[PDB]
Amino acid sequence: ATVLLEVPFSARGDRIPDAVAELRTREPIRKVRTITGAEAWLVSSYALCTQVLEDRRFSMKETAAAGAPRLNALTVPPEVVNNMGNIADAGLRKAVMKAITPKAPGLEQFLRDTANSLLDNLITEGAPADLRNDFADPLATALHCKVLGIPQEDGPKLFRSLSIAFMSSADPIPAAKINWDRDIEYMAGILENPNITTGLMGELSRLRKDPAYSHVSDELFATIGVTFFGAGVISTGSFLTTALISLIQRPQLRNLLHEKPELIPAGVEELLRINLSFADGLPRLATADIQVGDVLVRKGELVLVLLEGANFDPEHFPNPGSIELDRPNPTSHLAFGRGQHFCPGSALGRRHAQIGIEALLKKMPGVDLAVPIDQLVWRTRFQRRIPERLPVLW
Numbered sequence: 001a002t003v004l005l006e007v008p009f010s011a012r013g014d015r016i017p018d019a020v021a022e023l024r025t026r027e028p029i030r031k032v033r034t035i036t037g038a039e040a041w042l043v044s045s046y047a048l049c050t051q052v053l054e055d056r057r058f059s060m061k062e063t064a065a066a067g068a069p070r071l072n073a074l075t076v077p078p079e080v081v082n083n084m085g086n087i088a089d090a091g092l093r094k095a096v097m098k099a100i101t102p103k104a105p106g107l108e109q110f111l112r113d114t115a116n117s118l119l120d121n122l123i124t125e126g127a128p129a130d131l132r133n134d135f136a137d138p139l140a141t142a143l144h145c146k147v148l149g150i151p152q153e154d155g156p157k158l159f160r161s162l163s164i165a166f167m168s169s170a171d172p173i174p175a176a177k178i179n180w181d182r183d184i185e186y187m188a189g190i191l192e193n194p195n196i197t198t199g200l201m202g203e204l205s206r207l208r209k210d211p212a213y214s215h216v217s218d219e220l221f222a223t224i225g226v227t228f229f230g231a232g233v234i235s236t237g238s239f240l241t242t243a244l245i246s247l248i249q250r251p252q253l254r255n256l257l258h259e260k261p262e263l264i265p266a267g268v269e270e271l272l273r274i275n276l277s278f279a280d281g282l283p284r285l286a287t288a289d290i291q292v293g294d295v296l297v298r299k300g301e302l303v304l305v306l307l308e309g310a311n312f313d314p315e316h317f318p319n320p321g322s323i324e325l326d327r328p329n330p331t332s333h334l335a336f337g338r339g340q341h342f343c344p345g346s347a348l349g350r351r352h353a354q355i356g357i358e359a360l361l362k363k364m365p366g367v368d369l370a371v372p373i374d375q376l377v378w379r380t381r382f383q384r385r386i387p388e389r390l391p392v393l394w
């Protein structure tokens with residue numbers, strides 16, 4: 001006798017398990033058990049993944065309902081699971097999205113200068129260099145401090161909440177609440193700080209005193225700062241780190257992008273497609289009885305949308321494990337989700353990775369792992385797949 005198949009399959013972000021293609025071929029919607037002990041439907045084909053993500057009756061908000069089957073424990077207050085919905089209901093969606101575009105004046109040059117400075121420091125210290133802790137994550141932290149309008153010196157402390165905030169735990173995490181409440185108090189102080197006049201927190205600080213938003217709670221204003229810092233920094237930092245591994249493991253692509261840097265955007269789109277940075281399927285709770293493939297999902301059941309199920313589906317992306325720079329459908333991957341909850345920072349995330357890779361290939365054209373790839377230590381029970389350190393030489 002065997003127990004029900006458990007998720008996640010592997011914390012390794014450098015290879016996709018063979019199980020994924022087996023599930024996709026044989027039962028693209030399949031029952032599994034999550035780390036909390038709950039049962040869930042794991043969806044692993046492009047067609048069914050997109051169906052679930054495009055049907056709002058599969059609700060993100062309702063995953064926070066008391067007594068629901070859970071992928072993992074909440075690390076935020078339950079209302080914050082509806083964060084973007086709360087922002088939209090507050091009339092703040094356009095302002096938030098405008099503040100996080102990479103097209104802001106001097107934002108791309110700041111990104112380039114910051115990446116170049118980080119890399120110069122690594123070259124001065126000499127190999128080996130840790131491309132996660134001393135490049136990708138500081139670059140992500142600096143970018144989001146600039147985008148939020150908060151002092152660069154405040155970034156490191158805010159960043160150090162994230163190894164706990166984005167845990168994927170069977171049980172509530174006391175440290176998550178300590179850090180959450182402290183980070184909220186910080187952002188509430190930012191809103192009352194007269195020096196904070198640029199970026200997202202500068203714009204929120206002004207809207208807060210605007211009569212058209214007098215009804216919006218101070219709770220939400222602070223929450224936007226904490227959540228956009230946290231989600232943006234952990235997602236861009238983790239993607240860039242694991243994208244650098246994918247690139248280092250493909251020296252022919254690395255040499256090509258070094259020689260023809262105009263291909264970097266198409267390369268990053270492929271690196272997004274094959275990226276394993278999301279450690280769990282995207283969770284949704286059915287609010288009605290809904291047919292998904294051969295399964296009638298019942299109201300109240302948990303559904304998990306496995307992004308690498310969709311992104312490695314050969315019926316949508318032929319030769320899916322291969323990086324092809326001339327695909328007919330290159331942005332049709334689900335690395336940023338799909339539908340109601342499509343990532344609002346997708347443009348910023350792309351530019352972070354493009355500029356990071358562009359600077360790295362210019363400064364370190366011969367970059368390569370300094371340890372055998374199996375020696376990378378993959379973080380467990382976390383919402384992202386990342387190596388704890390990424391040691392390279394050049």
Ligand code: HEM
Pocket residue numbers: 060083084085100227228229231232233235236239282283334335336337338340341342343344345346348349350
């Ligand atoms: C390469 C970098 C990034 C990746 C791979 C990524 C991935 C994703 C994915 C897959 C979702 C959908 C989650 C779901 O449907 O359950 C999402 C949503 C979201 N992302 Fe991103 N993201 C990135 C960058 C960012 C940045 C830079 C920000 C903000 C500064 C951000 C903030 C958010 C927010 C607030 C949501 C929730 C949207 C909603 O519920 O409507 N992300 N992201």
